Write a protein that binds this ligand. Structure first.
Ligand SMILES: Cn1nc(-c2ccccc2)cc1C(=O)NC1CC1
Ligand SMILES: Cn1nc(-c2ccccc2)cc1C(=O)NC1CC1
Lengths: 296, 302
C-alpha cells in the first residue's frame, strides 16, 4: 500500500496531489526501470501489457489520466486482482471543441486554404465553402460529448438531430436534439458527427450501406473512436463524391499505416488531439491523482 | 431611379424585388463594351456581379447612370475613380455576406486553439506528432471583439456557447446594444491585458489602421491569439510578425492582407499563422443572397 509511478508526460498537478510518495519518468522501453512500487499512472504511450503486469507482482492499482483504457490489458489486470481506474469526464469539453472545429474546417476548407496559401497561391474560386446556418447536423451518440457538440452547433443555426438507444427523445429534446429512428437520420444530414462508444453494433456504423443512404455531398466527423466510420467505405464515398469531406482525429490503427484517407484532398486530420489541451490534461491528471489518494 | 439594367446572372428574385418597388427592369447577360453602353442609355441603375466590367469608358458614356450595384462587398470590375468623377453611387452587400464572415471567424478561433490546419499538414506529410500540437480549451477564455456590428454580434453569441467571456469595444455601438448580446464594453486599454483571443470586425479607416500594433501587442497578455477576417491593415502586418517572433502572439488567423494577394510571404509562411485567400464571403449561400440584397437596397432608395 502507498507508492506511485508516473511513466508518461502528465500535468505537474498529478505529482503535487499526495497520499505520500511519487516517482516520475518518461519514454521508457518494455525493459524500463522495472522495479515497480504499488501504483502505476499512465496516459497513452506507456503499454500496460500482460508481460509488464506479470513482471510487477507488487503492483496493486493501474490508473489512466484519460478516457478509456486501450493501452491497459484489463484481462491481465483482473488475473492478478489489479483494479483499473480512468477519467471518463476529463476530456469531454476538449473533444467537443475539437469536433466543432472539425465541422468548421469541413464547411470552409480552412486546412486546405492554409496549405494552398503556404504553396504561394491565391485561389479563392477553388474554395467555394458552405454556410452552417440552416444546415442539418446529425449527432450519433447523445452522451456528454454529443450533447456539448449539439448546444455549441445550435448557436450556428444548425438543425441538430440524432439518435441514441439510451438517451430518450424527451431527454435529447431538453438539449435541442431531435431524435428520429437511425434510418431516418442519414437522408437529412449535411453533416454527421459520431460520439458512440466503440461496440460490435457501432463498428462500421458508417459503412457502404449507410453512406448510400446519406444525402449526396455529406460531411463526416470522427473525433470519437477509430472504427465507427468504416475507413474503406469512407474512402470509396470520398472518391465517388457521396461524401464531400471528412474530419478524422481517430483511426483503426494509430498512427494510420494506410495513407489513402489522410492523403485525400477532402480529408482533414489530427494525430489524436481530442484530449490534447493543457486544461483536459490538468483535469485528467487531477481526477486520477485524487481517486488514487481516495484509497483508505 | 426608374430603369435598372442587370448586366450579369444572379437569382430571379432580384428582378421581382425591383418590379415590386415600381422599377423598370431589363435583364441581359454577356453584353459587349459597345452593347452595354447602348442598353444603359435610358438606365439610371446598373446591377453587376464580376463578369461585366464597368470601366471609365462605360461610366462616361452612360450619362444617365446614377447607381451601380455590386454582388458582394469588396472591389474588382468597377472603376471607382470614374464613378467618383461622375458622382455615381456604388452599392455593396455587407449584411448579406456578414453571416459567412462570422462563421469563418469562429472557425479561425477553433483553428488557432487546436492548430487543425497545421496538424492536417503534419498528417499529410506522414507524421504523427502528438506533443507538438498541445492545444488550448476555449471554455473559460476571454475573447475580445473589436467592432460590435452585425459580424461582431454573430461571432459573440456563437463563441458564448463555447463558454468564452466576450468583452469588446465599438465607439458607434452603445453599451446597452452590446449588453443585449452579452458583450461587456470596456475602453481599449482595459481590453488588451484581459484577452486570450482578439478578433477585429471594423471597416478599414485611419482610426482602425494598425489597431493591433507594437504598442497594443505589448499591452496584450503574452500568448494572445489574433483573428483578422475583416480588412487587411487593421492588424499592422509588420507588428504582428514581431509578436509571433517573440511569442507575445501565440498565433494568428488571417483571411485578409494589406495587399491581396500579399507579396511579403513572411506572415503566410509562419508556422503559427493560419490563412485563407479572402474567403469570408466565399460560400454558395452568401453569393446566392447578395443579388437579392442589391435589389432590396435599390428599392430602399425609392
Ligand atoms: C449503446 N449505444 N449505441 C449508440 C448509438 C447511437 C447512434 C447510432 C448507433 C448507436 C450509443 C450508445 C451509448 O452507449 N450511448 C450512451 C448514452 C451515452
Ligand atoms: C468606425 N468604427 N470604429 C470601430 C472600432 C472598434 C474597436 C476599436 C477601434 C475602433 C468600429 C467602428 C464601426 O464602424 N462600427 C460599426 C458597427 C459596425
Amino acid at each position: 500500500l502507498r507508492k506511485v509511478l508516473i511513466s508518461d508526460s502528465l500535468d505537474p498537478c498529478c505529482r503535487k496531489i499526495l497520499g505520500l510518495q511519487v516517482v516520475e519518468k518518461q519514454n521508457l522501453s518494455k525493459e524500463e526501470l522495472i522495479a515497480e512500487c504499488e501504483g502505476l499512472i499512465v496516459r497513452s504511450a506507456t503499454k500496460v501489457t500482460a508481460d509488464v503486469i506479470n513482471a510487477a507482482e507488487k503492483l496493486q492499482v493501474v490508473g489512466r489520466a484519460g478516457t478509456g483504457v486501450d493501452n491497459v490489458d484489463l484481462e491481465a489486470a483482473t488475473r492478478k486482482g489489479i483494479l483499473v481506474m480512468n477519467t471518463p469526464n476529463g476530456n469531454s469539453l476538449s473533444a467537443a471543441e475539437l469536433t466543432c472545429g472539425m465541422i468548421m474546417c469541413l464547411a470552409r476548407q480552412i486546412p486546405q486554404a492554409t496549405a494552398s496559401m503556404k504553396d504561394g497561391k491565391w485561389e479563392r474560386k477553388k474554395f467555394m465553402g458552405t454556410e452552417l446556418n440552416g444546415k442539418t447536423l446529425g449527432i450519433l451518440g447523445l452522451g456528454r460529448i454529443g450533447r456539448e457538440v449539439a448546444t455549441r452547433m445550435q448557436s450556428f443555426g444548425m438543425k441538430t438531430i440524432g439518435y441514441d438507444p439510451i438517451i430518450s427523445p424527451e431527454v435529447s429534446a431538453s438539449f435541442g436534439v431531435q431524435q428520429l429512428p437511425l434510418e431516418e437520420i442519414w437522408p437529412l444530414c449535411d453533416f454527421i458527427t459520431v460520439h458512440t462508444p466503440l461496440l460490435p453494433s457501432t463498428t462500421g456504423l458508417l459503412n457502404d450501406n449507410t453512406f448510400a443512404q446519406c444525402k449526396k455531398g455529406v460531411r463526416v466527423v470522427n473525433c470519437a473512436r477509430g472504427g465507427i466510420v468504416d475507413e474503406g467505405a469512407l474512402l470509396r464515398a470520398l472518391q465517388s463524391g457521396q461524401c464531400a469531406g471528412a474530419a478524422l482525429d481517430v483511426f483503426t490503427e494509430e498512427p494510420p499505416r494506410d495513407r489513402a484517407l489522410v492523403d485525400h484532398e477532402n480529408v482533414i486530420s489530427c494525430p489524436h488531439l481530442g484530449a490534447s489541451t493543457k486544461e483536459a490534461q490538468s483535469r485528467c491528471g487531477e481526477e486520477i491523482a485524487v481517486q488514487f489518494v481516495d484509497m483508505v
